[PDB]
Amino acid sequence: PGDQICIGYHANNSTEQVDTIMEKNVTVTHAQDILEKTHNGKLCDLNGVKPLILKDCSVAGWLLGNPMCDEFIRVPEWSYIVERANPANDLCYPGSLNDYEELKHMLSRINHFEKIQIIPKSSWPNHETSLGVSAACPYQGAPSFFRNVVWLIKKNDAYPTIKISYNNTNREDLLILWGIHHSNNAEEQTNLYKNPITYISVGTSTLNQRLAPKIATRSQVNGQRGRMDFFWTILKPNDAIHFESNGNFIAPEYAYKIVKKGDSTIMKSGVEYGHCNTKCQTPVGAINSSMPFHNIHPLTIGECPKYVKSNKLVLATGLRNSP
């Protein structure tokens, strides 16, 4: 019947369970999860810069001026590019864009982007600048063409040898695009360019390119058997570019003043922009967190926790609860 002094610990009504190296399913008073699984579900700005959201257009269609792809550039600077998985408006007239993927990589994060006309249509007095129109590139139902380049055709059954130059009197780098049209037969060559054998020469301080058309039989793509291969180069300030051709020349009209400081990648996502900000962006939503690990998505853009294949990382903070 004597007096007693006891020693013990705290218990509560917690259902939280943690696993140890030697035991599983151990209920504890308090616990904390270091895994992050929450995203706001929106496309947000990365460190205050709005992403360039191409809606139904690819980078190639946007750059060359696909008639169904929106002009006006809007964003002069972007942090990352959001394309769709399979953009509808890539290249209305079938062909290719040389080094498309590295070009996409460079344009992922642009500090300054401005479209300036470098070669106006009035600079082709001896050629036809208004008939380079195909049903492959329709606008308002009427046949059209890429906006930022001009499809030069013969005039009065003659195609004088084109020799033009541009000096880049700007203080920023210029992105210039041009192309070559591959005909289907020798008659199309004469009916469009009048010169049976043609060439294209582009020259800068660092670019030495000579192309020739490849007349051959190909399948129909967008109802067209011909092809047009597009090329691009970066023209440094005070450096000049020289074009020489006598046929099959898709001449540039507009170029792009471009300034690039940082680098990013292109994200494939369809979810909607939400007027927010974040330090970590994923294709399904942005992450605001300080936790060291997450399992939302592996294709992250920004400063993010480490991606893991786990549903729970629960640390035991409290004592061993016992009912």
Binding site: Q4, C6, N12, I21, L299, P305, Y307, A316
Partner: protein, 170 residues
């Protein structure tokens, strides 16, 4: 300790994490040792932070940027992304399992330390019951109880007084 001498756990002890329970002829109440607890929560909070705050995070842009004729390079990137995933997944899982033990053994040690301090304060003027509770001989007042909880045990008081209760009715 936690499942050793003390077998259960007091739902009535809501003041702290570790503590005491006195049961004498004038009362029966719980109490805590704010010293021994606050080191545990501070240390536990430090452990949770030390795991979170030591992670270095840098800006990275992850995407799929290789075409159908660069599958070997994309496979090279897959081995890297997957390889880093397994490194981070395995390390995270074992880190929690190893550290979750250490928290539980940490709580084991503090309770045993509180028990060990009392065992020497009272020497053999009380009984070790094996349940963690100590069976007093000398009869202990709330002042005497406090001398055990927050160490102020003026042992000279009951040194002889225990003799007049310890071995008497035997």
């Amino acid at each position: 300790a936690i499942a050793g001498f003390i077998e259960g756990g007091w739902q009535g002890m809501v003041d702290g994490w570790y503590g005491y329970h006195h049961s004498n002829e004038q009362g029966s109440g719980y109490a805590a040792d704010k010293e021994s607890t606050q080191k545990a929560i501070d240390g536990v909070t430090n452990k949770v932070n030390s795991i979170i705050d030591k992670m270095n995070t840098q800006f990275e842009a992850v995407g799929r940027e290789f075409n159908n004729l660069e599958r070997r390079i994309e496979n090279l990137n897959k081995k890297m992304e997957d390889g880093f995933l397994d490194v981070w997944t395995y390390n995270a899982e074992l880190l929690v399992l190893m550290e979750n033990e250490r928290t539980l053994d940490f709580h084991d040690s503090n309770v045993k330390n509180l028990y060990d301090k009392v065992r020497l304060q009272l020497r053999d003027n009380a009984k070790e019951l094996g349940n963690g509770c100590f069976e007093f001989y000398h009869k202990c007042d709330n002042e005497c109880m406090e001398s055990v909880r927050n160490g102020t045990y003026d042992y000279p008081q009951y040194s002889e007084e225990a003799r007049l209760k310890r071995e008497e009715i035997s």
